[PDB]
Design a protein around this nucleic acid. Structure first.
Lengths: 98, 107, 91, 81, 92, 104, 79, 98
DNA sequence: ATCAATATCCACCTGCAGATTCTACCAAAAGTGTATTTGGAAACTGCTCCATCAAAAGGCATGTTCAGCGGAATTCCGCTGAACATGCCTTTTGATGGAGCAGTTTCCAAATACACTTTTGGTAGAATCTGCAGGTGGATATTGAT
DNA sequence: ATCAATATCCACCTGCAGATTCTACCAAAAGTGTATTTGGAAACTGCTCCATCAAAAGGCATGTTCAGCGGAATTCCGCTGAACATGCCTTTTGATGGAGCAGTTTCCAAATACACTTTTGGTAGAATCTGCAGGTGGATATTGAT
């Protein structure tokens, strides 16, 4: 049977996803998470649709960003696998702890 | 009754950029050349990125500029990249970039 | 109020056969109002730092130098000056 | 009632975000560290967003509210509603 | 050349009567006040604009404080603020 | 005075003037300058209070920039509020990455 | 050369305040480069604030305002 | 001939300098550097005594902090010697490049 | 464990640079009383769009198995920075002209402020146009096994 | 290098959705044109505080030796990526009531606008005072060696 060596599909997917621009997080699931976090801050709160979309635009932008920095710390470590401490180092230097 | 935009040789609204300079409460008074000079800069700035977005689109065989085009145009330009180094263009994606040590084989 | 029709003119000026989507025009609007607020504020401030109650073509110019990167600022200063000079001699 | 919606950000979706981020290989611990990071990120923008909404005596969070909030955090976003 | 230096000196005494403060220290406190003032003023200005209002009132000042200061610090800063206004009003 | 009317050491009247000449808005309500002044007195109090402690602790009575620095960074909140502020002549907190200490 | 004026002992000292124990040889020319790019950004903005005021003297306020824009707010010299 | 071991004096130096607050760079070499860079921006300039102080206060302050992050990037890579690439990464993750 | 060299901590001493106390002058606040103007809350309400319920279908999340390979931990070695004692070349400190940073007076180009008249960018209503999304297919690479 | 399995490429082709197209309405802009106010350039000037330089002083450059650190090569055990089967819950297409946003008018509590009288926080000149930074003595913790 045909089988790609590990990491081939991954490069395939980096190339793939770096060409597109659609949100990579399921919509409804994300909206729930927004509503949840919001209502555990205030009540009787309604949301314009585009408002939940701005938040998803920003969140993904933010996370993809974090991931590139995290990916850099890993390579500095001579690893290719981003580990939790990578995110922590990145986040710290980034100025979110530090 | 010539508009001030034409008096200045501009597409952008000198009268409008002048109002906004009043409603923005930036100072007690607004000089006559203030809005003129600023609409000149704003026009200059939008022509610069549109020039780039448009190109990005040609390189993408697309006729209509879309967000990813603005994105590609902005990130590929050193100066626009710096001017908008903290702006997130929605629906723009990222620039295709894969670290070398990730690619397989050698040489 | 928008900057859309103005973005469209310029657009047609650089690329006569190219169009723009609404989201793209939306980002182009956000862009303009953004630069507009930075330059304004940089200007506003500059004046207060100088005990001046009036923003003028001279504060705007400095603001533009403080806020824009290398080659962009140089070219933007020209465009600004050229326009002020022209409008100056037209009435 | 909404509870545990943080799990609504599937391992798959976090894997895709990392590909765009150009990440090749991911550790099992990454997915949970990320929900945390995304959680904090959102708690911060929505707090502000909502603070803006309240001040306008409204009951609806508008995109402007999210847009002003993001700007307050140095994460200015272009193109919104 | 105005400075908050004397008012800073007042407050200091109500907190540490035997404590004094060097010049350089007093200048830093001055920048410190000027800073938060601007940060608070700005946010309030901004808030009034988003709401197409012409006046920066204490409602404005208040919210800005919630947006700018860290939680618990904001908690007290609000009370303090609220108290100061109540006192001022309830006075002939 | 107004500061006395609101019960404050800070200059309510001045704060008011600065809010007008600041071009922050067309109009300025009467509480705003009072409320704001309240918050500047309070914030001032919070830092002086901690830095005074920092001085007593180092066995000194006159507070110096180093005592403002120490009070600020050793305090989650104020440290956040001054997260991108550099206090001249303040120095840095004493800290050494454990992994750099001699292997006991 | 002035940049070379910033000495190894001085640089090694800074790094120590940063809690740095062992310093590779190549760090010094690397360091001066950072500092060079730093000053250039600040000084330019300051010199600009200088010229706007028509002074031939950079005032500490012109540096303070500069720093504020770089996001490097500095308490101690007014403002 | 009693001699100290590698890192013992340095460590004592760390301790030492983290208590003091004074500039670690000599005033004159620095004033000269500031002036030369300014000259490229506008000739025949004069600097206030305080303006140079501020700039120095800021530069060391700046450089010092850049060193803490570098140290962290070194340690993240199972090292104790901060190297060029360790600075490189830090600046990239602070946006001083990206 | 045992000296032996250094470094570090501490209780104390004291000149002095800078913090403190005092008087006087004072313009520029900041307080106060009159009276004219106005922003924005309250009250009614039109109307956008938010929530939400319903349903059909496959795009995708989930969970499992399998093994390739990458990270962790151990060893080994050459080379690189740390520590040191030598030595003097540069920075530091206190003094002395003069250049501009500001304080003040003058006065005109330029910015309100007001009343009109005119041109326009926004738009909601309908309806014709068009770029490309997305489905198809089959010629060209990319891969991985041998 | 050859060969089979798959994915990537890319140019042709059709359809809905979103874009470019008009008719006319027009309040709110933006323009035009006196009338009245004024901010800040411009020229003159005194007082700081900055540039320069001399010579007392407090670090830095330099060469040596070597301890220990980073880079390299090796080993192995476990965890993450690929491939696959299965089936659910998200996405999509629509419709409905009603909340609550946003428009419009009324109208008074609060705010701007002078104008007059008082206080006060900044400055400058002078003398008094004091918190501590360097400085010493001497005990003791720390470190590196045998």
């Amino acid at each position: 049977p045909h089988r790609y060596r590990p990491g081939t599909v991954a490069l395939r997917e980096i190339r793939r996803y770096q060409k597109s621009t659609e949100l990579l997080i399921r919509k409804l699931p994300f909206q729930r998470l927004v509503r949840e976090i919001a209502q555990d801050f205030k009540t009787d709160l309604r949301f314009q649709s585009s408002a939940v979309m701005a938040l998803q635009e920003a969140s993904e932008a933010y996370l993809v960003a974090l991931f590139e920095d995290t990916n850099l710390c890993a390579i500095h470590a001579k690893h290719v696998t981003i580990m939790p401490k990578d995110i922590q180092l990145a986040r710290r230097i980034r100025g979110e702890r530090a | 009754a010539k508009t001030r935009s034409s008096r200045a040789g501009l597409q952008f609204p000198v009268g409008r950029v002048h109002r906004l300079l009043r409603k923005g409460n930036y100072a007690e008074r607004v000089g006559a050349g203030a809005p003129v000079y600023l609409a000149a800069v704003l026009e200059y700035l939008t022509a610069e990125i549109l020039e780039l977005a448009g190109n990005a689109a040609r390189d993408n065989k697309k006729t209509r500029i879309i967000p990813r085009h603005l994105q590609l145009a902005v990130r590929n330009d050193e100066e626009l990249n710096k001017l908008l180094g903290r702006v997130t263009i929605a629906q723009g994606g990222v620039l295709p970039n894969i670290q070398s040590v990730l690619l397989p084989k050698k040489t | 109020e928008s900057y859309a029709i103005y973005v469209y003119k310029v657009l047609k000026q650089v690329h006569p056969d190219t169009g723009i989507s609404s989201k793209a025009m939306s980002i182009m609007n956000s862009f303009v109002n953004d630069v507009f607020e930075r330059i304004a504020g940089e200007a506003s401030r500059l004046a207060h730092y100088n005990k001046r109650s009036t923003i003028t073509s001279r504060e705007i110019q400095t603001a533009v130098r403080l806020l824009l990167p290398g080659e962009l600022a140089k070219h933007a200063v020209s465009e600004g000056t050229k326009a002020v000079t022209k409008y100056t001699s037209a009435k | 009632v909404l509870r545990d919606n943080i799990q609504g950000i599937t391992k798959p979706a976090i894997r895709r975000l990392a590909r765009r981020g150009g990440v090749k290989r991911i550790s099992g611990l990454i997915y949970e560290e990320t929900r945390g990071v995304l959680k904090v990120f959102l708690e911060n923008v929505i707090r502000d967003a909502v603070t803006y909404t309240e001040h306008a005596k409204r009951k609806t969070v508008t995109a402007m509210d999210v847009v002003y909030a993001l700007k307050r955090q140095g994460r200015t976003l272009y193109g919104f509603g």
